[PDB]
Amino acid sequence: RGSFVEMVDNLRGKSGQGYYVEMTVGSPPQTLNILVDTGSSNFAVGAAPHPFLHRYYQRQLSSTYRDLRKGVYVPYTQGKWEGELGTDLVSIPHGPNVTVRANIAAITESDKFFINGSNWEGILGLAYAEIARPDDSLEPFFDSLVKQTHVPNLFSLQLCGASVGGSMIIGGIDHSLYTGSLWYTPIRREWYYEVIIVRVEINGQDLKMDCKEYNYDKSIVDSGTTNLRLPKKVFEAAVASIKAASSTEKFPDGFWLGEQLVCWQAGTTPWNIFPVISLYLMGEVTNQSFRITILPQQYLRPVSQDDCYKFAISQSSTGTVMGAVIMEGFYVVFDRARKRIGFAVSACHVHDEFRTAAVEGPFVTLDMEDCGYN
Numbered sequence: 001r002g003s004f005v006e007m008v009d010n011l012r013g014k015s016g017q018g019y020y021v022e023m024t025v026g027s028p029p030q031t032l033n034i035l036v037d038t039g040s041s042n043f044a045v046g047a048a049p050h051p052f053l054h055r056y057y058q059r060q061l062s063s064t065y066r067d068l069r070k071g072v073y074v075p076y077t078q079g080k081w082e083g084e085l086g087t088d089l090v091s092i093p094h095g096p097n098v099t100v101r102a103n104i105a106a107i108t109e110s111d112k113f114f115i116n117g118s119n120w121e122g123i124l125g126l127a128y129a130e131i132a133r134p135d136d137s138l139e140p141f142f143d144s145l146v147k148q149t150h151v152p153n154l155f156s157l158q159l160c161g162a163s164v165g166g167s168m169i170i171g172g173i174d175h176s177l178y179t180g181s182l183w184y185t186p187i188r189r190e191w192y193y194e195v196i197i198v199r200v201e202i203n204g205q206d207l208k209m210d211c212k213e214y215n216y217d218k219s220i221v222d223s224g225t226t227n228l229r230l231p232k233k234v235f236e237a238a239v240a241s242i243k244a245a246s247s248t249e250k251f252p253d254g255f256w257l258g259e260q261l262v263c264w265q266a267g268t269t270p271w272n273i274f275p276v277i278s279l280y281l282m283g284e285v286t287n288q289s290f291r292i293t294i295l296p297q298q299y300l301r302p303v304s305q306d307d308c309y310k311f312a313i314s315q316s317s318t319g320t321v322m323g324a325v326i327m328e329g330f331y332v333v334f335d336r337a338r339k340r341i342g343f344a345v346s347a348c349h350v351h352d353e354f355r356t357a358a359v360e361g362p363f364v365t366l367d368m369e370d371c372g373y374n
């Protein structure tokens with residue numbers, strides 16, 4: 001408890017292409033780099049020689065592979081993957097010293113899934129069975145891990161933006177990874193890591209929307225999404241306020257829509273004209289909340305001879321998504337055992353001399369249950 005040195009720095013990434021952990025599958029072990037995804041629930045790996053893949057799972061080489069004789073088709077947007085289900089022995093070399101038999105989807109055909117130039121070959125869905133494919137009987141990796149071992153039912157993530165890196169602490173918390181205190185928000189329902197946002201401020205100015213809007217139709221914590229995604233009506237209100245706050249300088253209307261980038265000469269990004277963004281989350285106690293605050297350092301993503309950033313807040317029709325934009329400010333504890341998510345200021349987050357990311361409480365917020373969409 002509290003210290004897991006062998007797991008520190010076990011994540012790598014390329015900016016905007018997520019964070020991956022090294023895993024092994026089968027016997028003898030086949031090493032793969034695997035995207036850490038709290039937004040889905042399948043352990044799915046490249047299993048055929050797609051041109052974009054550094055490597056792939058070769059089931060014929062594994063003495064421990066068991067075929068489940070079942071296929072899985074997984075459309076979404078933007079993309080799709082198809083595969084064949086089986087089980088095999090899975091380990092995390094820079095994780096706990098255990099080996100479990102997990103479900104693996106062997107991806108045999110995909111569209112807009114693998115990224116050309118990325119260094120990962122599969123994804124580790126760390127969310128709940130309720131959103132597993134094809135259905136909730138396909139046990140997710142973390143569920144198997146907890147069933148078959150003495151690993152405590154929690155994991156935590158420190159994503160450090162900019163080549164990026166971070167830490168996935170499986171089975172506990174490492175106190176070196178954060179400063180100040182952890183504050184907890186309930187997991188509303190075990191499918192995605194669903195939370196409830198109860199208030200939103202831009203530079204301390206409340207958006208004053210019916211808080212149900214902040215959670216239409218859900219709000220989730222998703223390490224497999226780069227951006228902070230906001231429901232359309234909230235995004236509209238959010239940019240308008242950010243536009244206003246940052247009107248010292250003018251940017252093309254396309255910029256706020258992510259349709260074009262914006263640049264400055266090196267060493268001269270005007271951070272301070274940009275507002276902080278605060279989400280108040282439902283707390284653990286009745287009528288009690290806390291707030292997490294992020295900087296432009298988080299929502300203006302590094303992508304000429306100038307420093308060019310993409311506006312990394314965007315509209316959604318699937319609800320709020322707290323992607324890397326949020327998570328890179330914080331140490332995030334997925335406390336599955338207690339159905340709660342902890343946030344603390346991350347010991348590695350990008351800031352400046354004037355402003356840092358913050359996690360502050362307690363605040364008094366009434367009618368927070370009304371903020372949940374049904």
Ligand SMILES: NC1=N[C@](c2ccc(OC(F)F)cc2)([C@@H]2C[C@H]2C(=O)c2cncc(Cl)c2)CO1
Pocket residue numbers: 016017018019035037038039040041042074075076113123131132133222223224225226324
């Ligand atoms: N959280 C989430 N993961 C994704 C995903 C892909 C299929 C699913 O299959 C199905 F179960 F929905 C589920 C999620 C993609 C794996 C993520 C992805 O490709 C990605 C690309 N660039 C940057 C990042 Cl941080 C991630 C989409 O959003």
Ligand code: NA
Pocket residue numbers: 145146147148149150151
């Ligand atoms: Na156990």
Ligand code: NA
Pocket residue numbers: 175176177178179180
């Ligand atoms: Na600490």
